[PDB]
Amino acid sequence: PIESIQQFVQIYGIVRDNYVDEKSDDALFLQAIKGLVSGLDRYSRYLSAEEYRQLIQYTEGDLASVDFVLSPESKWMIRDLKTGSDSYKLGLRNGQTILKIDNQELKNLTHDQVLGLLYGSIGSTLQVQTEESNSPISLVRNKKIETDIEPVMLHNQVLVLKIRVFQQDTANEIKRLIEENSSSRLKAVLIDLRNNPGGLLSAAVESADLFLNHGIIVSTKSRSEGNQQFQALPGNDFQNIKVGILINHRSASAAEVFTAAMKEHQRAWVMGEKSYGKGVVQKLFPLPSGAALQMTVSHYYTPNGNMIEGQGIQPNQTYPLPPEMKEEVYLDRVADLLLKR
Amino acid sequence: PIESIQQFVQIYGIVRDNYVDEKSDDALFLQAIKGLVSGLDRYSRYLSAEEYRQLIQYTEGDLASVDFVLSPESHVHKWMIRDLKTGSDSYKLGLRNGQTILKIDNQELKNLTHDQVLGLLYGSIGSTLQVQTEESNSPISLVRNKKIETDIEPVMLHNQVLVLKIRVFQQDTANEIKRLIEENSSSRLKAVLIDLRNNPGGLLSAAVESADLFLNHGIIVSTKSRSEGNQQFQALPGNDFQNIKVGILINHRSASAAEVFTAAMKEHQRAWVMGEKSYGKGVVQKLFPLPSGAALQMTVSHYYTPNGNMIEGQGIQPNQTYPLPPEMKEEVYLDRVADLLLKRK
Ligand SMILES: [Cl-]
Ligand SMILES: [Cl-]
Ligand SMILES: [Cl-]
Ligand code: NA
Ligand code: NA
């Protein structure tokens, strides 16, 4: 790359010699490294030795929230914030009230709609506006959140399985909840994947394999990991069971793999709004400096060959949560649409 | 820089060998160049040969807007596009005469005056703005590529305060301030209010000459630079308007030259500044041509106030904070601002 190397050192020299402020070579190369890695996609980046030490503590694909909780007291106030935590260092304190999360007012939202904004993949970012501070604050979802499928039997005999994240036991837990509620009365199963940031790819593949006897569930394009293709397997465990999937703009990664597999094999009717559009596998690359690189090494592809990253999954029938409609009413109306198939 | 060069080539190798997509050396170094130059500040960047050819067409510090106009002609609060010429950049993007613009930089035009709309539409030439049309569900990025000719807009208020609206500092601004103040001087004139709201700047020299009209001594502005050297512009003797009381009105869009003028008049206690903190833009940029035909736009100097305060990133705090209250009529705000100026010793 002699022609490119020559252009780079020429520019480096002009920057070092004419920028208003004299910068160190260590600072200039660090700016060059950030552009080299972050210029690949919106998820690849350089990690400082500390950002790396912090990221190794978390398991990849865990559901997480902030290092505190919000509770309504006549106003969503901060509570359980531990002294010395990253949020404490940024200025947050127990008692302060949060008015917005990612420009969305918490007035009129339920405890669930607030968790919907607070929850996300571990390591992810969110902004908060406090009534005290006059400016927004960037926080990191660094607190792992344990979850189980949340089942609800609707009056119309539709079993709703709320999956906030795919975990090692998700597939076995879907099997158990459907069977424990299965009978001549069960009409259909509605899988609520709204606000599901993903979780384990293997769990989404196993979950889809419960309802598919053949065909590719998902394919991966990778140079360092190789081009894999996960195929479904025979087993009429769930053949006569009608299935629906509910997604929102926060449904992502593994949740999109599962949704796409079920939709493109026409096994489930997908309702809601277009998914987030995140279909990447990242790997951490330690450096001698102690720092590291977080980089995309694989892209997920749907059975029809569609790239999930940047596109997202379009539902079979668009029906987002209408403005200020009550949650349990939206669930019932979504269940009604599924029964009319 | 052996330790940092070794780290850079190691990272380059990891990217080239493991990124999901095989990328060319030309593309990897280009991403490294963009991070190296854009990583300096929010105004420095690499320009492709085309981005450079486009930038040289515009004159530095000219006031500009989009290649069309907005006027409500359908409904009273729906701003429709008019004067859009076929073949223009906006026409190629999908905009058409008749379409309605609901937002500019996420701000609804619904309840705004013709002035508040120009406030969002106007800006330094080459600048960017986003627009949401009623016909589209997604935003559109436009460039202020149409220069806007201007003159000082004078208004004599009933309280005998002369308001001089300066949308941008130009070569004739100083002479025009002198002429408008003199042709309106009399035993009745109480004070002069310089309205610099939404003024993106213009020529530094024009702001310095404008401040020199009201100052007999002291530094108007200083420049800190390695490639240009540390210069400092001083005021000169000549009591042009010794007995003239002066006020300055600024908003969050008042910037660069407008901030230099405002800071000079404020820190020498020559004018009472009201409104809200200025934008905070005090940089001098230089273009660095490259053999590829491309170039680098980079900050080479910072402007400093008389007290030695840096304008870039700080902005100028007014003497008395008084932003346009919610839904207050413009003429009323101007009268209240003029009243505050008259209540000064
Ligand atoms: Cl080579
Ligand atoms: Cl060195
Ligand atoms: Cl020119
Ligand atoms: Na199967
Ligand atoms: Na003078």
PDB file of all heavy atoms in Angstrom, chain A residues 7 16 18-20 25 29 31 35-36 40 223 288-289 296 299, chain B residues 1 4 7 10 16 19-20 22 31 35-36 40-41 226 292 299 302:
ATOM      1  N   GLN A   7       0.302   8.854   1.130  1.00  0.00           N
ATOM      2  CA  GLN A   7      -0.760   9.885   1.276  1.00  0.00           C
ATOM      3  C   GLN A   7      -1.049  10.076   2.772  1.00  0.00           C
ATOM      4  O   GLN A   7      -1.174  11.239   3.208  1.00  0.00           O
ATOM      5  CB  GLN A   7      -2.048   9.494   0.534  1.00  0.00           C
ATOM      6  CG  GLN A   7      -3.042  10.651   0.425  1.00  0.00           C
ATOM      7  CD  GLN A   7      -4.406  10.290  -0.118  1.00  0.00           C
ATOM      8  OE1 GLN A   7      -4.984   9.262   0.239  1.00  0.00           O
ATOM      9  NE2 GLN A   7      -4.969  11.187  -0.922  1.00  0.00           N
ATOM     10  N   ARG A  16      -0.155  17.506  12.037  1.00  0.00           N
ATOM     11  CA  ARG A  16       0.781  17.753  13.156  1.00  0.00           C
ATOM     12  C   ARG A  16       1.369  19.165  13.080  1.00  0.00           C
ATOM     13  O   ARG A  16       1.474  19.803  14.136  1.00  0.00           O
ATOM     14  CB  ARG A  16       1.947  16.759  13.125  1.00  0.00           C
ATOM     15  CG  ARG A  16       2.998  17.087  14.174  1.00  0.00           C
ATOM     16  CD  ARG A  16       4.361  16.485  13.965  1.00  0.00           C
ATOM     17  NE  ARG A  16       4.431  15.062  14.220  1.00  0.00           N
ATOM     18  CZ  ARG A  16       5.570  14.380  14.283  1.00  0.00           C
ATOM     19  NH1 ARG A  16       6.721  15.009  14.118  1.00  0.00           N
ATOM     20  NH2 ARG A  16       5.557  13.081  14.535  1.00  0.00           N
ATOM     21  N   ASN A  18       0.202  22.006  11.266  1.00  0.00           N
ATOM     22  CA  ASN A  18      -0.621  23.233  11.100  1.00  0.00           C
ATOM     23  C   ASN A  18      -1.884  23.237  11.977  1.00  0.00           C
ATOM     24  O   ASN A  18      -2.593  24.287  11.961  1.00  0.00           O
ATOM     25  CB  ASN A  18      -1.003  23.457   9.636  1.00  0.00           C
ATOM     26  CG  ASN A  18       0.196  23.496   8.711  1.00  0.00           C
ATOM     27  OD1 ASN A  18       0.979  22.555   8.669  1.00  0.00           O
ATOM     28  ND2 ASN A  18       0.320  24.545   7.920  1.00  0.00           N
ATOM     29  N   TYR A  19      -2.188  22.160  12.713  1.00  0.00           N
ATOM     30  CA  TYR A  19      -3.431  22.255  13.527  1.00  0.00           C
ATOM     31  C   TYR A  19      -3.239  23.353  14.583  1.00  0.00           C
ATOM     32  O   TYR A  19      -2.119  23.508  15.095  1.00  0.00           O
ATOM     33  CB  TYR A  19      -3.851  20.915  14.124  1.00  0.00           C
ATOM     34  CG  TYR A  19      -5.171  20.994  14.847  1.00  0.00           C
ATOM     35  CD1 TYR A  19      -6.338  21.274  14.155  1.00  0.00           C
ATOM     36  CD2 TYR A  19      -5.268  20.774  16.207  1.00  0.00           C
ATOM     37  CE1 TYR A  19      -7.559  21.362  14.800  1.00  0.00           C
ATOM     38  CE2 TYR A  19      -6.484  20.849  16.869  1.00  0.00           C
ATOM     39  CZ  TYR A  19      -7.634  21.150  16.164  1.00  0.00           C
ATOM     40  OH  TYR A  19      -8.836  21.218  16.802  1.00  0.00           O
ATOM     41  N   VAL A  20      -4.305  24.105  14.869  1.00  0.00           N
ATOM     42  CA  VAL A  20      -4.261  25.234  15.843  1.00  0.00           C
ATOM     43  C   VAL A  20      -3.557  24.785  17.131  1.00  0.00           C
ATOM     44  O   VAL A  20      -2.781  25.586  17.680  1.00  0.00           O
ATOM     45  CB  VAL A  20      -5.672  25.788  16.136  1.00  0.00           C
ATOM     46  CG1 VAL A  20      -6.614  24.727  16.704  1.00  0.00           C
ATOM     47  CG2 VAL A  20      -5.621  27.003  17.054  1.00  0.00           C
ATOM     48  N   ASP A  25       1.920  12.548  19.045  1.00  0.00           N
ATOM     49  CA  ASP A  25       1.814  11.473  18.026  1.00  0.00           C
ATOM     50  C   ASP A  25       0.867  10.394  18.550  1.00  0.00           C
ATOM     51  O   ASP A  25       0.065   9.870  17.765  1.00  0.00           O
ATOM     52  CB  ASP A  25       3.194  10.926  17.677  1.00  0.00           C
ATOM     53  CG  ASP A  25       4.058  11.961  16.979  1.00  0.00           C
ATOM     54  OD1 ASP A  25       3.498  12.734  16.167  1.00  0.00           O
ATOM     55  OD2 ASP A  25       5.266  12.022  17.281  1.00  0.00           O
ATOM     56  N   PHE A  29      -2.285   9.192  16.257  1.00  0.00           N
ATOM     57  CA  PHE A  29      -2.510   7.784  15.838  1.00  0.00           C
ATOM     58  C   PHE A  29      -3.799   7.253  16.478  1.00  0.00           C
ATOM     59  O   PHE A  29      -4.536   6.513  15.804  1.00  0.00           O
ATOM     60  CB  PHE A  29      -1.307   6.890  16.135  1.00  0.00           C
ATOM     61  CG  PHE A  29      -0.201   6.991  15.118  1.00  0.00           C
ATOM     62  CD1 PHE A  29       0.937   7.739  15.360  1.00  0.00           C
ATOM     63  CD2 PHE A  29      -0.297   6.310  13.915  1.00  0.00           C
ATOM     64  CE1 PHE A  29       1.942   7.825  14.410  1.00  0.00           C
ATOM     65  CE2 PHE A  29       0.712   6.394  12.967  1.00  0.00           C
ATOM     66  CZ  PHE A  29       1.829   7.150  13.218  1.00  0.00           C
ATOM     67  N   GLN A  31      -6.532   8.874  17.046  1.00  0.00           N
ATOM     68  CA  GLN A  31      -7.651   9.416  16.214  1.00  0.00           C
ATOM     69  C   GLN A  31      -7.705   8.642  14.887  1.00  0.00           C
ATOM     70  O   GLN A  31      -8.821   8.396  14.384  1.00  0.00           O
ATOM     71  CB  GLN A  31      -7.470  10.916  15.951  1.00  0.00           C
ATOM     72  CG  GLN A  31      -7.504  11.784  17.206  1.00  0.00           C
ATOM     73  CD  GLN A  31      -7.136  13.227  16.937  1.00  0.00           C
ATOM     74  OE1 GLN A  31      -7.047  13.675  15.794  1.00  0.00           O
ATOM     75  NE2 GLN A  31      -6.911  13.978  18.002  1.00  0.00           N
ATOM     76  N   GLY A  35     -10.886   6.094  13.503  1.00  0.00           N
ATOM     77  CA  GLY A  35     -11.523   6.197  12.172  1.00  0.00           C
ATOM     78  C   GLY A  35     -11.368   4.911  11.378  1.00  0.00           C
ATOM     79  O   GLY A  35     -12.293   4.546  10.634  1.00  0.00           O
ATOM     80  N   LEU A  36     -10.223   4.254  11.532  1.00  0.00           N
ATOM     81  CA  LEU A  36      -9.954   2.976  10.836  1.00  0.00           C
ATOM     82  C   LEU A  36     -10.970   1.918  11.278  1.00  0.00           C
ATOM     83  O   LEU A  36     -11.564   1.275  10.403  1.00  0.00           O
ATOM     84  CB  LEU A  36      -8.531   2.520  11.185  1.00  0.00           C
ATOM     85  CG  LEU A  36      -8.153   1.126  10.685  1.00  0.00           C
ATOM     86  CD1 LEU A  36      -8.230   1.065   9.175  1.00  0.00           C
ATOM     87  CD2 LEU A  36      -6.766   0.733  11.153  1.00  0.00           C
ATOM     88  N   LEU A  40     -15.717   1.098   9.752  1.00  0.00           N
ATOM     89  CA  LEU A  40     -16.158  -0.211   9.191  1.00  0.00           C
ATOM     90  C   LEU A  40     -17.684  -0.309   9.261  1.00  0.00           C
ATOM     91  O   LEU A  40     -18.290  -0.649   8.243  1.00  0.00           O
ATOM     92  CB  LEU A  40     -15.506  -1.357   9.980  1.00  0.00           C
ATOM     93  CG  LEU A  40     -13.983  -1.448   9.898  1.00  0.00           C
ATOM     94  CD1 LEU A  40     -13.438  -2.507  10.847  1.00  0.00           C
ATOM     95  CD2 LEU A  40     -13.524  -1.732   8.480  1.00  0.00           C
ATOM     96  N   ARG A 223     -15.412 -14.523   7.339  1.00  0.00           N
ATOM     97  CA  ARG A 223     -14.096 -14.952   6.797  1.00  0.00           C
ATOM     98  C   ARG A 223     -13.316 -15.654   7.912  1.00  0.00           C
ATOM     99  O   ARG A 223     -12.741 -16.730   7.650  1.00  0.00           O
ATOM    100  CB  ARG A 223     -13.308 -13.763   6.237  1.00  0.00           C
ATOM    101  CG  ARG A 223     -14.002 -13.028   5.100  1.00  0.00           C
ATOM    102  CD  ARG A 223     -12.999 -12.143   4.388  1.00  0.00           C
ATOM    103  NE  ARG A 223     -12.390 -11.218   5.324  1.00  0.00           N
ATOM    104  CZ  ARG A 223     -11.243 -10.585   5.133  1.00  0.00           C
ATOM    105  NH1 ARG A 223     -10.536 -10.787   4.036  1.00  0.00           N
ATOM    106  NH2 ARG A 223     -10.787  -9.762   6.059  1.00  0.00           N
ATOM    107  N   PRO A 288      -1.481  -5.927  22.743  1.00  0.00           N
ATOM    108  CA  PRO A 288      -0.410  -5.932  23.740  1.00  0.00           C
ATOM    109  C   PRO A 288      -0.525  -4.732  24.700  1.00  0.00           C
ATOM    110  O   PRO A 288      -0.182  -4.862  25.857  1.00  0.00           O
ATOM    111  CB  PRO A 288       0.873  -5.857  22.894  1.00  0.00           C
ATOM    112  CG  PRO A 288       0.461  -6.352  21.522  1.00  0.00           C
ATOM    113  CD  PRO A 288      -0.974  -5.898  21.363  1.00  0.00           C
ATOM    114  N   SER A 289      -0.999  -3.595  24.180  1.00  0.00           N
ATOM    115  CA  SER A 289      -1.207  -2.329  24.928  1.00  0.00           C
ATOM    116  C   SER A 289      -2.168  -2.535  26.109  1.00  0.00           C
ATOM    117  O   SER A 289      -2.180  -1.682  27.005  1.00  0.00           O
ATOM    118  CB  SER A 289      -1.738  -1.276  23.970  1.00  0.00           C
ATOM    119  OG  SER A 289      -2.095  -0.075  24.637  1.00  0.00           O
ATOM    120  N   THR A 296     -16.979  -6.532  13.928  1.00  0.00           N
ATOM    121  CA  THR A 296     -17.921  -7.399  13.256  1.00  0.00           C
ATOM    122  C   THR A 296     -17.117  -8.431  12.462  1.00  0.00           C
ATOM    123  O   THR A 296     -16.229  -8.014  11.683  1.00  0.00           O
ATOM    124  CB  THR A 296     -18.844  -6.593  12.329  1.00  0.00           C
ATOM    125  OG1 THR A 296     -19.513  -5.590  13.091  1.00  0.00           O
ATOM    126  CG2 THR A 296     -19.869  -7.457  11.635  1.00  0.00           C
ATOM    127  N   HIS A 299     -22.078 -11.705   9.406  1.00  0.00           N
ATOM    128  CA  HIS A 299     -23.424 -11.105   9.193  1.00  0.00           C
ATOM    129  C   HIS A 299     -24.464 -12.225   9.174  1.00  0.00           C
ATOM    130  O   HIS A 299     -24.146 -13.301   8.636  1.00  0.00           O
ATOM    131  CB  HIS A 299     -23.549 -10.295   7.898  1.00  0.00           C
ATOM    132  CG  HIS A 299     -22.797  -9.015   7.898  1.00  0.00           C
ATOM    133  ND1 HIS A 299     -22.998  -8.047   8.859  1.00  0.00           N
ATOM    134  CD2 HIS A 299     -21.963  -8.478   6.990  1.00  0.00           C
ATOM    135  CE1 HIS A 299     -22.243  -7.003   8.592  1.00  0.00           C
ATOM    136  NE2 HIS A 299     -21.607  -7.241   7.450  1.00  0.00           N
TER     137      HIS A 299
ATOM    138  N   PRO B   1       7.543   7.828  16.723  1.00  0.00           N
ATOM    139  CA  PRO B   1       6.364   7.201  17.375  1.00  0.00           C
ATOM    140  C   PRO B   1       6.310   5.671  17.189  1.00  0.00           C
ATOM    141  O   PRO B   1       5.232   5.149  16.941  1.00  0.00           O
ATOM    142  CB  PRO B   1       5.145   7.844  16.681  1.00  0.00           C
ATOM    143  CG  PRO B   1       5.658   9.150  16.160  1.00  0.00           C
ATOM    144  CD  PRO B   1       7.103   8.900  15.811  1.00  0.00           C
ATOM    145  N   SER B   4       3.516   3.660  18.964  1.00  0.00           N
ATOM    146  CA  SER B   4       2.165   3.908  18.383  1.00  0.00           C
ATOM    147  C   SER B   4       2.112   3.417  16.927  1.00  0.00           C
ATOM    148  O   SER B   4       1.041   2.944  16.521  1.00  0.00           O
ATOM    149  CB  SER B   4       1.669   5.339  18.569  1.00  0.00           C
ATOM    150  OG  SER B   4       2.495   6.287  17.921  1.00  0.00           O
ATOM    151  N   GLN B   7       1.489  -0.248  17.098  1.00  0.00           N
ATOM    152  CA  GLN B   7       0.087  -0.548  17.484  1.00  0.00           C
ATOM    153  C   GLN B   7      -0.816  -0.334  16.263  1.00  0.00           C
ATOM    154  O   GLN B   7      -1.695  -1.174  16.034  1.00  0.00           O
ATOM    155  CB  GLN B   7      -0.368   0.314  18.667  1.00  0.00           C
ATOM    156  CG  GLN B   7      -1.696  -0.139  19.271  1.00  0.00           C
ATOM    157  CD  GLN B   7      -2.266   0.786  20.325  1.00  0.00           C
ATOM    158  OE1 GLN B   7      -2.095   2.004  20.279  1.00  0.00           O
ATOM    159  NE2 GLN B   7      -3.015   0.215  21.256  1.00  0.00           N
ATOM    160  N   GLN B  10      -0.476  -3.137  13.676  1.00  0.00           N
ATOM    161  CA  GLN B  10      -1.053  -4.395  14.225  1.00  0.00           C
ATOM    162  C   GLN B  10      -2.573  -4.356  14.039  1.00  0.00           C
ATOM    163  O   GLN B  10      -3.123  -5.341  13.522  1.00  0.00           O
ATOM    164  CB  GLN B  10      -0.678  -4.578  15.694  1.00  0.00           C
ATOM    165  CG  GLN B  10      -1.109  -5.926  16.252  1.00  0.00           C
ATOM    166  CD  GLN B  10      -0.737  -6.110  17.702  1.00  0.00           C
ATOM    167  OE1 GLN B  10      -0.158  -5.233  18.347  1.00  0.00           O
ATOM    168  NE2 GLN B  10      -1.086  -7.268  18.229  1.00  0.00           N
ATOM    169  N   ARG B  16      -7.816  -5.877   8.400  1.00  0.00           N
ATOM    170  CA  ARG B  16      -7.670  -6.439   7.039  1.00  0.00           C
ATOM    171  C   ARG B  16      -7.904  -7.948   7.031  1.00  0.00           C
ATOM    172  O   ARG B  16      -8.546  -8.420   6.099  1.00  0.00           O
ATOM    173  CB  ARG B  16      -6.270  -6.085   6.543  1.00  0.00           C
ATOM    174  CG  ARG B  16      -5.791  -6.780   5.279  1.00  0.00           C
ATOM    175  CD  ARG B  16      -4.476  -6.100   4.955  1.00  0.00           C
ATOM    176  NE  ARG B  16      -3.649  -6.759   3.968  1.00  0.00           N
ATOM    177  CZ  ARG B  16      -2.487  -6.282   3.529  1.00  0.00           C
ATOM    178  NH1 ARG B  16      -2.023  -5.128   3.980  1.00  0.00           N
ATOM    179  NH2 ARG B  16      -1.792  -6.960   2.632  1.00  0.00           N
ATOM    180  N   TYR B  19     -12.042  -8.612   9.402  1.00  0.00           N
ATOM    181  CA  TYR B  19     -13.351  -7.929   9.244  1.00  0.00           C
ATOM    182  C   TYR B  19     -14.246  -8.800   8.353  1.00  0.00           C
ATOM    183  O   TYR B  19     -13.721  -9.446   7.433  1.00  0.00           O
ATOM    184  CB  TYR B  19     -13.195  -6.497   8.730  1.00  0.00           C
ATOM    185  CG  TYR B  19     -14.513  -5.772   8.647  1.00  0.00           C
ATOM    186  CD1 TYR B  19     -15.226  -5.488   9.801  1.00  0.00           C
ATOM    187  CD2 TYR B  19     -15.049  -5.365   7.434  1.00  0.00           C
ATOM    188  CE1 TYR B  19     -16.453  -4.849   9.751  1.00  0.00           C
ATOM    189  CE2 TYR B  19     -16.272  -4.717   7.371  1.00  0.00           C
ATOM    190  CZ  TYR B  19     -16.974  -4.455   8.534  1.00  0.00           C
ATOM    191  OH  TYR B  19     -18.174  -3.812   8.495  1.00  0.00           O
ATOM    192  N   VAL B  20     -15.550  -8.821   8.640  1.00  0.00           N
ATOM    193  CA  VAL B  20     -16.534  -9.664   7.891  1.00  0.00           C
ATOM    194  C   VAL B  20     -16.321  -9.506   6.384  1.00  0.00           C
ATOM    195  O   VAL B  20     -16.411 -10.522   5.668  1.00  0.00           O
ATOM    196  CB  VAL B  20     -17.991  -9.344   8.289  1.00  0.00           C
ATOM    197  CG1 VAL B  20     -18.376  -7.896   8.012  1.00  0.00           C
ATOM    198  CG2 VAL B  20     -18.974 -10.290   7.619  1.00  0.00           C
ATOM    199  N   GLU B  22     -13.876  -8.195   3.105  1.00  0.00           N
ATOM    200  CA  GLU B  22     -12.470  -7.962   2.704  1.00  0.00           C
ATOM    201  C   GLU B  22     -12.429  -6.526   2.159  1.00  0.00           C
ATOM    202  O   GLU B  22     -13.157  -6.263   1.196  1.00  0.00           O
ATOM    203  CB  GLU B  22     -12.111  -9.072   1.718  1.00  0.00           C
ATOM    204  CG  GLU B  22     -10.707  -9.031   1.175  1.00  0.00           C
ATOM    205  CD  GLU B  22     -10.392 -10.242   0.306  1.00  0.00           C
ATOM    206  OE1 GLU B  22     -11.065 -11.293   0.474  1.00  0.00           O
ATOM    207  OE2 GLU B  22      -9.465 -10.142  -0.518  1.00  0.00           O
ATOM    208  N   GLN B  31     -10.444   5.553   5.690  1.00  0.00           N
ATOM    209  CA  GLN B  31     -11.173   5.578   6.993  1.00  0.00           C
ATOM    210  C   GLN B  31     -10.220   6.094   8.084  1.00  0.00           C
ATOM    211  O   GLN B  31     -10.684   6.821   8.989  1.00  0.00           O
ATOM    212  CB  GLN B  31     -11.705   4.189   7.366  1.00  0.00           C
ATOM    213  CG  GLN B  31     -12.730   3.616   6.392  1.00  0.00           C
ATOM    214  CD  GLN B  31     -13.050   2.158   6.646  1.00  0.00           C
ATOM    215  OE1 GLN B  31     -12.645   1.566   7.646  1.00  0.00           O
ATOM    216  NE2 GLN B  31     -13.771   1.552   5.713  1.00  0.00           N
ATOM    217  N   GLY B  35     -10.641   9.691  10.335  1.00  0.00           N
ATOM    218  CA  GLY B  35     -10.598   9.730  11.811  1.00  0.00           C
ATOM    219  C   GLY B  35      -9.477  10.625  12.301  1.00  0.00           C
ATOM    220  O   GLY B  35      -9.646  11.300  13.329  1.00  0.00           O
ATOM    221  N   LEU B  36      -8.353  10.615  11.588  1.00  0.00           N
ATOM    222  CA  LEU B  36      -7.192  11.461  11.951  1.00  0.00           C
ATOM    223  C   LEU B  36      -7.570  12.945  11.871  1.00  0.00           C
ATOM    224  O   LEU B  36      -7.304  13.666  12.846  1.00  0.00           O
ATOM    225  CB  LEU B  36      -6.052  11.153  10.979  1.00  0.00           C
ATOM    226  CG  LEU B  36      -4.819  12.040  11.101  1.00  0.00           C
ATOM    227  CD1 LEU B  36      -4.222  11.950  12.493  1.00  0.00           C
ATOM    228  CD2 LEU B  36      -3.796  11.658  10.044  1.00  0.00           C
ATOM    229  N   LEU B  40      -9.893  15.834  15.234  1.00  0.00           N
ATOM    230  CA  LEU B  40      -9.268  17.078  15.768  1.00  0.00           C
ATOM    231  C   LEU B  40     -10.333  17.955  16.429  1.00  0.00           C
ATOM    232  O   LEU B  40     -10.101  18.386  17.571  1.00  0.00           O
ATOM    233  CB  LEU B  40      -8.582  17.840  14.626  1.00  0.00           C
ATOM    234  CG  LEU B  40      -7.386  17.148  13.974  1.00  0.00           C
ATOM    235  CD1 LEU B  40      -6.905  17.914  12.751  1.00  0.00           C
ATOM    236  CD2 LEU B  40      -6.249  16.964  14.967  1.00  0.00           C
ATOM    237  N   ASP B  41     -11.427  18.234  15.712  1.00  0.00           N
ATOM    238  CA  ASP B  41     -12.546  19.067  16.234  1.00  0.00           C
ATOM    239  C   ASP B  41     -13.771  18.868  15.326  1.00  0.00           C
ATOM    240  O   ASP B  41     -13.670  18.098  14.358  1.00  0.00           O
ATOM    241  CB  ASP B  41     -12.132  20.530  16.426  1.00  0.00           C
ATOM    242  CG  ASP B  41     -11.668  21.245  15.172  1.00  0.00           C
ATOM    243  OD1 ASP B  41     -11.879  20.694  14.081  1.00  0.00           O
ATOM    244  OD2 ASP B  41     -11.080  22.341  15.302  1.00  0.00           O
ATOM    245  N   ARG B 226      -0.539  28.735  15.385  1.00  0.00           N
ATOM    246  CA  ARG B 226       0.863  28.266  15.232  1.00  0.00           C
ATOM    247  C   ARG B 226       1.307  28.575  13.798  1.00  0.00           C
ATOM    248  O   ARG B 226       2.415  29.122  13.623  1.00  0.00           O
ATOM    249  CB  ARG B 226       0.993  26.774  15.560  1.00  0.00           C
ATOM    250  CG  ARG B 226       0.603  26.430  16.990  1.00  0.00           C
ATOM    251  CD  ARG B 226       0.915  25.019  17.484  1.00  0.00           C
ATOM    252  NE  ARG B 226       0.276  23.895  16.798  1.00  0.00           N
ATOM    253  CZ  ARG B 226       0.886  23.009  16.003  1.00  0.00           C
ATOM    254  NH1 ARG B 226       2.190  23.077  15.782  1.00  0.00           N
ATOM    255  NH2 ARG B 226       0.181  22.037  15.451  1.00  0.00           N
ATOM    256  N   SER B 292      -3.731  14.280  -4.791  1.00  0.00           N
ATOM    257  CA  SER B 292      -4.895  13.497  -5.295  1.00  0.00           C
ATOM    258  C   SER B 292      -5.981  14.424  -5.858  1.00  0.00           C
ATOM    259  O   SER B 292      -6.880  13.926  -6.559  1.00  0.00           O
ATOM    260  CB  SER B 292      -5.469  12.620  -4.202  1.00  0.00           C
ATOM    261  OG  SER B 292      -6.035  13.398  -3.154  1.00  0.00           O
ATOM    262  N   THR B 299      -8.801  23.631  11.325  1.00  0.00           N
ATOM    263  CA  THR B 299      -8.747  24.778  12.210  1.00  0.00           C
ATOM    264  C   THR B 299      -7.268  25.135  12.409  1.00  0.00           C
ATOM    265  O   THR B 299      -6.491  24.222  12.760  1.00  0.00           O
ATOM    266  CB  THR B 299      -9.405  24.470  13.563  1.00  0.00           C
ATOM    267  OG1 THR B 299     -10.743  24.021  13.358  1.00  0.00           O
ATOM    268  CG2 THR B 299      -9.411  25.659  14.497  1.00  0.00           C
ATOM    269  N   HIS B 302      -7.739  30.231  16.761  1.00  0.00           N
ATOM    270  CA  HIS B 302      -8.917  30.413  17.649  1.00  0.00           C
ATOM    271  C   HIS B 302      -9.086  31.906  17.936  1.00  0.00           C
ATOM    272  O   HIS B 302      -8.063  32.600  18.030  1.00  0.00           O
ATOM    273  CB  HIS B 302      -8.802  29.641  18.969  1.00  0.00           C
ATOM    274  CG  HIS B 302      -8.898  28.161  18.836  1.00  0.00           C
ATOM    275  ND1 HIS B 302      -9.998  27.553  18.269  1.00  0.00           N
ATOM    276  CD2 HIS B 302      -8.102  27.169  19.284  1.00  0.00           C
ATOM    277  CE1 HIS B 302      -9.839  26.247  18.306  1.00  0.00           C
ATOM    278  NE2 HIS B 302      -8.690  25.988  18.938  1.00  0.00           N
TER     279      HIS B 302
END
